[PDB]
Symmetry: D3
Subunit: 281 residues, 6 copies
């Protein structure tokens, strides 16, 4: 694998383009309108800057990397790629189209991956005629820095495909784990319900938000407490993941707490809005 | 606020006594037979020893510490204390008798406390005629080191009893949190189900134990993966907690996984037994 | 004996257990003309029931509800005893003992042997299976539940609990004599909570959940149900009135019997019961008394 | 507070308007067409007519009251009110647009309230720029007579706003209770599952509809049995509320019975159809 | 009862048509296009050809039967039919639309029946002014051969209507059972969760697909194992039935397995797609 | 030992429990050429077991499936005993005693001390944890489930239940021997209800729920399953045949282990059982037998 197309130039996709080019990959980068593309690369630049300034790298490089990334709106710039990675909108009917297109645009050895965290990789792969070569590559925010990628295997994902994607994840200095498609994969499945439990304790007046976080930081030696972490991830993001667990499994076990619903409804989503379980004023 | 009795010379009780003496409290240490008392004073002797074998402490306040800690089997030796802490075994029929007697044996001002994780403070207080000063003091193994204390308020626990125990927890260098009785308090209530969730991912073949633990470490920035963590706490202890959550709440959400039961049934309880989710040589 | 209403073929009743409910039930029968045998184990206990009935009848002569000479005639129709054999010729026996399947089964086993073939044997239990109890006898077609409501002499509802084996003829007879003592019987196929408790106690339990998440205060919960639903009492004070220990045990039974989490008792309700704040009877519940 | 606007001239809108007018408030009653406004005015006229015929008030008192009520189809007539109460259809996209216009129409002091039984106050509040001033005021049918109102605090509802709405409630001779937003508030939360439990008993052949209602009447000393009560509230309404409980909480505990579904699907909704659990021929 | 109309010339519709015609009933077979009606008539011709080829029926009995069947695109031709059987649309709004015209189109005594498994008969009957005359008639594939018919009563279906459909089920050589409308009736309600349970056993690595099926053929003397039975029915249909059971009852008990979902998402639907739990290559 | 099929390396088998299943299991091994030790607590029970076997074989003789002399030969390979020590040299022990974990652990612990290191110890339990039982021995790798179906001489299936510590070799040996006695074994990792009961008993429980809600009658429920799913018996009939108390006890276990309300036993099944209406064997369950 030498050339990579990353689709969707948002926070995640542009982070993913960085991570790859910062390791010698020829990176294509598509979105839907030149505006979006630019918001994207403009996003990557700001980031390298912070590193050059921190003296974690040398301007000389930033320039170099930024020349490996080639923005675009022509979907067809992917035909050439060895690996495509979609980090578009968490909406199924669209992923299916992007994927059915790419299945046609791209040569046969291309592997089509998705960064989705809550849609079925298996179902997306059914839109193509190469489901053996469809897979999940779940990055973590922020992508250039974070080591983990959950590589999500659809039920039809071949071993060849898994192996190549795993290899590539190592070439770019990441640390992949192997996951069979299931709701929430490994990390969200375990982490988010723990946040949901914390809000359940708070809601019952068992303890306060600060004592809950402290108990977790000190009791289980966690870096951040659950509620805090909730605000940091975003409570809407947390809510939507619980929703997905509940809806996929059909198990009350994963019902999101009623209080969480209320915070989200109020627009109190945490840090990104100045207010969640804590105040950011 | 000076004299402190401790019942139970197991790991927990012994560590609590040590943690108290270490800050200059007169400490009694009670069990039902010298073997245990000695066996516990013995255990203290070592940690304190393992300590003076680094820069940790001077051998002056090794021997100065063991001076403050006087061990007995004479329940009657508690009568003077300002605070008492039960760390005996998790049988309720027994904790009530322990607590009733102490109710007669002590001075009106004496506050009684338990270190239980899984029995109701409130129900225990009901054995006594001073519920207003019955409380929970939940320590974290190893007691001398771990800073957190969950102060568990029975429903009848007075705010004065609470404020005392809070002050005397900070007194001894700990960092208490106020918890109202409910199953699993805060830490266990959040953390154990997280372990339970990880076994469920393992059971369905989603990921391997190595990958599950690695995903949680890199993805959630946890110091230990949950399966490794369960092996460390002990899988029997993990299961007893989930049993209690399920039993107390009556909510299926907290049902212990079927695979976790099988591990415990095999005696594969983790580190202490040489085998759990991981093999320990 | 012609003082017993013609609608009821049965004419003699044994009540076993001389507690509150048992005294009350004997009083209700005696008041309507039945010869009543009232049995317990110690003479102390029987005598405690008889002058509990006395105390009640005394209260009625004082409000001019009945004449003093009528009270006397009623107490005259109730004969205390410890001899379970006195039940032998009774047409109906109502057990109002403590709630232990194993004791209760023994009583019914005993009675089944003691009593003539036509006798019907009834329990006033709230939470134990009539069918199981009937299986400890050789006349399960004559075993039945008769669930009275405290206070028995006043409250008109009787929840006739039919077992899987209780015969129509046995239900028909218990129904007519329930009417004959001025009660209003409903026909219930054994199931957890019958009707009243099944609906009513989860209502209380729902209320404590609202309280527990701080949705409303207890005063506002009880106020809301009284004004909004036109209930004579608010759920929380009603729980305090029934007894919170009693409420928890009923929810325990509903969850146990059905296996459905729907009926799990609230954590907070357990916690009040564990403090011993059982409501009115103990001076403290959701309200201070 | 002196001027009140009610949006919606159905049974509740009109009843609410009347209860305000009867106690000396000026009332603007608005709806989308004259014929609706007229209808609600007609409906109010009759109720008052009864009270005169019944010798509860005088023809004189009745014309006073009618005089304090002004009809209109123009939402702008709310610009000037201290309190707007919304009693429209239980649709969220609609309640949001109403509340958003009001936000722009009304003076900053105007409090915006909803008589909704099942939509989120918090979520409605979020469609405006005055969330501190959005609140739930839940009246019980028939509004002029029923004393109770549930004052529903959204999560950002100010203490000022609650205090005003409470004083105003007391001032129209009502009895207010404070309720933080939660599915079914207090009354529907207890009451409707009670009815739903009764249909479950019926569905399993445990007892007949007459016997069930009679047991609850004599056994619990209720004025109506649950089944005749469901027929009186309306079975469709009972089902919609069970639906909301279950949807909001995610807990199977509040799943509506299967038989209730079937009755509603038949159009056997209770008194309003001539048929529910009872026949009303 | 003598003339029957069948709406839908697909597999079930023409099966049901053939079943009636073979027993001497006049049958009108309607679909929306000549294309579809001919297809269904061809399908029936082939079935009756198979039967003469295997000497089950004379080739002039075949002729008699086809003579008793008229094709049409016009619902108006149901007008004088004594019984109409709808066997197409598994969409509620279209079913209601159809039942509503038939109600206007048909003599008053016409009974109107659905072959649906998943949609409420009661709800469908409500779109008509003759709900006493609306009933479920549930056939089993292949309709000419399978003897069972589940006769599904809406809550308003009358005894008379039930009795007529029972007697005519028997006259076409079938064996009716009386079922009060409820989710999955009898057969699907018991059978499909059997299959869904088998997939849960497979998912947990408890046994292999071959052993699970073997265990049920030998252990319970079933003709097919649950997993091959699922393949044979179609996993998309099994999943939809479980969706309905969960949807209707709101009970988690009937939640479809996560793994069944993954299979249907892959398009591995069983025999009909060449792959399900088994490979049919 | 020349009469033992060569496919089985195990040659000597001991069965513990002379009840219906244990003595059916003994008969199944003996009829295939194994020497069997049949052990119970009192001579009286052993004799009941031997007589049960005798009776089954006499039917076989009566139907001409076997000759009278074969019946007596087969009985001669079964040795009744109360001496649990007769197991010491056996290659395979199968426990089919009462369904009580405390008793079962004791038996297994005795056998572990008595028997040679090679002996494999199996339980026919349908409801207790194999793994938990194995923990009461010092040879858990050699502990296994061997779940037979009533009647054991005729039903071909055996569910072979591997505890978490059950070795491949132990499993392989049980599989071989299973095949050797004409059975068809399946490999089952320990889980509540294994395969068959897990699927089959909730079917029955679903049917009582249908009946309880007035959806269909018992006759119609069973008719529909026979005709509709091509089942040879309807589920309520089947419940009656198995024993309603057995069916309830299996749901209890399914619910107890999983903690999932999905497997809660229906309220009306509880009530039948409490009545003593257990099905065929009590003359009454969902059908009346007469």
């Amino acid at each position: 694998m030498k050339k990579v197309c990353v689709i969707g130039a948002g926070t995640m996709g542009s982070g993913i383009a960085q991570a790859f080019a910062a390791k010698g990959f020829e990176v294509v980068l598509r979105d839907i309108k030149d505006e979006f593309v630019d918001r994207g690369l403009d996003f990557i630049n700001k980031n390298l800057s912070k590193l050059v300034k921190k003296g974690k790298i040398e301007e000389a490089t930033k320039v170099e990397i930024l020349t490996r990334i080639s923005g675009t709106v022509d979907l067809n710039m992917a035909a050439d790629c060895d690996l495509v990675i979609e980090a578009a909108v968490e909406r199924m009917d669209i992923k299916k189209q992007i994927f059915a297109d790419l299945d046609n645009i791209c040569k046969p050895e291309t592997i089509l991956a998705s960064n989705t965290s809550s849609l079925s990789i298996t179902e997306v792969a059914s839109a193509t005629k190469r489901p053996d070569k469809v897979i999940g590559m779940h990055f973590f925010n922020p992508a250039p820095v974070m080591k983990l990628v959950e590589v999500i295997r659809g039920i039809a994902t071949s071993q060849e495909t898994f192996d190549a994607v795993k290899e590539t994840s190592i070439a770019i200095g990441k640390d992949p784990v192997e996951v069979a498609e299931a709701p929430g994969f490994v990390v969200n499945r375990i982490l988010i319900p723990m946040i949901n439990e914390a809000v359940g304790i708070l809601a019952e007046g068992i303890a306060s938000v600060e004592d809950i976080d402290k108990a977790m930081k000190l009791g289980a030696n966690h870096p951040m407490g659950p509620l805090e972490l909730g605000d940091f991830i975003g409570l809407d993001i947390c809510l939507a993941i619980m929703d997905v667990l509940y809806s996929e499994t059909g198990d009350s076990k994963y019902r999101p707490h009623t209080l969480l619903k209320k915070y989200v409804r109020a627009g109190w989503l945490g840090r990104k809005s100045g207010k969640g379980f804590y105040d950011y004023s």
